[PDB]
Swiss-Prot record:
The keyword Protein biosynthesis applies. Inhibited by the quinazolinone-based compound febrifugine from the Chinese plant Dichroa febrifuga which is used to treat malaria-associated fever. Also inhibited by febrifugine derivatives such as halofuginone. Signal peptide: none annotated. One of its GO terms (biological process) is prolyl-tRNA aminoacylation. It comes from Plasmodium falciparum (isolate 3D7). One of its GO terms (molecular function) is ATP binding. The lineage of its organism: Eukaryota, Sar, Alveolata, Apicomplexa, Aconoidasida. The chain holds residues 251 to 746 of 746 of the full protein. L-proline binds at residues 136, 226. The keyword Chloroplast does not apply. This is Proline--tRNA ligase. It catalyses: tRNA(Pro) + L-proline + ATP = L-prolyl-tRNA(Pro) + AMP + diphosphate. It is found in: Cytoplasm. ATP binds at residues 136-140, 147-151, 221-223, 258-260.
Length: 482
């Protein structure tokens, strides 16, 4: 009912349920894989959505909105997906003439019109984005935020005269996804390129951002940015008149990130007292709680607290003053801790006498006293350090989850020990399923290749692939995955 009753290590999954619900982030729903986002949760989405929008306007990306529905034949104009499509069949009691499908992505919808908007080089680059929801009916069991059947996302689609233009933006968007996670969610991600076997069917290459849940040792795709080259341009006959009057195919990118990011954050920073929010995604930065008992204290406290509130708010630091008389101080402590509020300020008699108050960080529970005069400044610096600390703890933790090894058995040791592994690899696609099905022999417990990180350690000259025996091309991250 109230309090988290499962240790994050002991039942991590029951923990997650308890946290997301009891923190007022979500509510479950009578349709599997769909979840209600209460304001505490949606606020987080809005914050990142603001950030991302800001950043893509600088790349002249423009928002837009395409329809939620797509027709059978249009949709089937990408591979291995059709069993995941939800079909609208009727309206009221009337069967529709043809099935129509709910968007799982907007490629087919959008790219059918592109040729119409793109006749010449003067038309390029074309840069669109959507904030919409999409629907995929997925076999693997749904889990709030991480794998949802409906989900909010942003989906970006661009088209350019040439690769230099296009690829450059791919990596531009990838960095924005890093910042999304690091500057806002304080979640560290590793940028990489996916393997041929795991990359997006219609992409030249898929660049990715990868996170890792230490507790169950599962990696997770945090965001995705593709160079598509001309693949879709061939499929939808999207062409332009060159600066010389030769017809050309366009070079496109698509990229997207979803509410999954919210789940990643929760899993990262959440603890046994409950939700822990980086301040940049919590409406309330501070909760002010009075702690006193003699009735004589009552007016003078209500004031001191109301004063402290005034200071913060003036400074555009939103906060709550829990002054409710029918709740124990410990109720209030637990409650706001659980809800993720970064800072509690405690006000009692010893602080009025002393012109001060106790501040307490949500991230690690250090308390201090600070003279009222300098509360504003100390609160601001605190909030920053809480971000600094949440992030840095999470990067120390990520790094300890990554073991660099060279042999197959070193690999299995690491995998058995809930790690993810950095290993030399030849990159032959034929090895991927072998490696998957054969590790799974010792949610799916196979070792997937996650991403070939951009930041490569050096490659010894004779270094062999840990599986093929073939000489290894580059270091790749492998792990069990969400
Ligand atoms: N069911 C889902 N719920 C929430 N987010 C999702 C879901 N499926 C994919 N994503 C995210 O969507 C982004 C874009 O990738 P996309 O190509 O749409 O999905 P995917 O690669 O098919 N799924 P996965 O195997 O789970 O990473 C990725 O960063 C995924 O993390
Ligand atoms: O959705 C994608 C590719 C990209 N589209 C928008 C930007 C980011 C995103 O990775 C991969 N994908 C994922 N799931 C799908 C599910 C179905 Br059903 C279909 Cl038809 C198609 C797809 C499908 O194409
Ligand atoms: Na994943």
């Amino acid at each position: 009912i109230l309090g988290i009753t499962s240790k994050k290590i002991e039942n991590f999954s029951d923990w997650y349920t308890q946290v997301i619900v009891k923190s007022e982030l979500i509510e479950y729903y009578d349709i599997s894989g769909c979840y209600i986002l209460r304001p505490a949760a949606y606020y987080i989405w809005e914050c990142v959505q603001a950030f991302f929008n800001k950043e893509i306007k600088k790349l002249n990306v423009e928002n837009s909105y395409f329809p939620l529905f797509v027709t059978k034949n249009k949709l089937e104009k990408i591979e291995g997906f059709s069993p995941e499509v939800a079909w609208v069949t009727k309206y009221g009691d009337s069967n529709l003439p043809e099935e129509i499908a709910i968007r799982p992505t907007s490629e087919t919808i959008m790219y059918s019109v592109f040729p119409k908007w793109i006749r010449s080089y003067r038309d390029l680059p074309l840069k669109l984005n959507q904030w919409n929801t999409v629907v995929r009916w997925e076999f693997k069991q749904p889990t709030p935020f991480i794998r949802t059947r409906e989900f909010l996302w942003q989906e970006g689609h661009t088209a350019h005269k040439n690769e230099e233009e296009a690829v450059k933006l791919v990596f531009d968007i990838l960095d924005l996804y890093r910042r999304w996670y690091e500057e806002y969610l304080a979640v560290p991600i590793i940028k990489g390129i996916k393997s041929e076997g795991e990359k997006f069917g219609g992409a030249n290459f898929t660049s990715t951002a990868e996170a890792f849940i230490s507790e169950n040792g599962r990696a997770i795709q945090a965001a995705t940015s593709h160079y598509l080259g001309t693949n879709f341009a061939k499929m939808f006959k999207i062409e332009f008149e060159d600066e010389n009057e030769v017809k050309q195919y366009v070079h496109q990118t698509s990229w997207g990130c979803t509410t999954r990011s919210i789940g990643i954050m929760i899993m990262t920073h959440g603890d046994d007292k409950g939700l822990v929010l980086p301040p940049n995604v919590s409406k309330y930065k501070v909760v002010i709680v009075p702690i006193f008992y003699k009735t004589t204290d009552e007016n003078a406290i209500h004031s001191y607290c109301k004063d402290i509130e005034k200071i913060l708010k003036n400074a555009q630091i939103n906060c709550v003053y829990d002054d409710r008389a029918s709740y124990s101080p410990g109720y209030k402590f637990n409650h706001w801790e659980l809800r993720g509020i970064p800072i509690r300020i405690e006000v009692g008699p010893k602080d009025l006498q002393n012109n001060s108050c106790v501040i307490v960080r949500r991230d690690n529970n250090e308390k201090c006293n600070v003279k009222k005069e300098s509360v504003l400044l100390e609160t601001q610096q605190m909030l920053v350090d809480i971000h600094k600390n949440l992030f840095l703890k999470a990067k120390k933790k990520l790094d300890d989850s990554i073991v660099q090894v060279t042999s197959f058995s070193e690999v299995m040791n690491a995998l058995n020990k809930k790690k993810m592994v950095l290993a030399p690899w030849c990159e032959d696609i034929a090895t991927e399923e072998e490696i998957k099905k054969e590790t799974q022999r010792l949610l799916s417990g196979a070792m997937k290749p996650l991403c070939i990180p951009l930041d490569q350690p050096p490659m010894p000259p004779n270094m062999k692939c840990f599986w093929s025996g073939k000489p290894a091309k580059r270091w790749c991250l492998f792990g069990r995955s969400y």
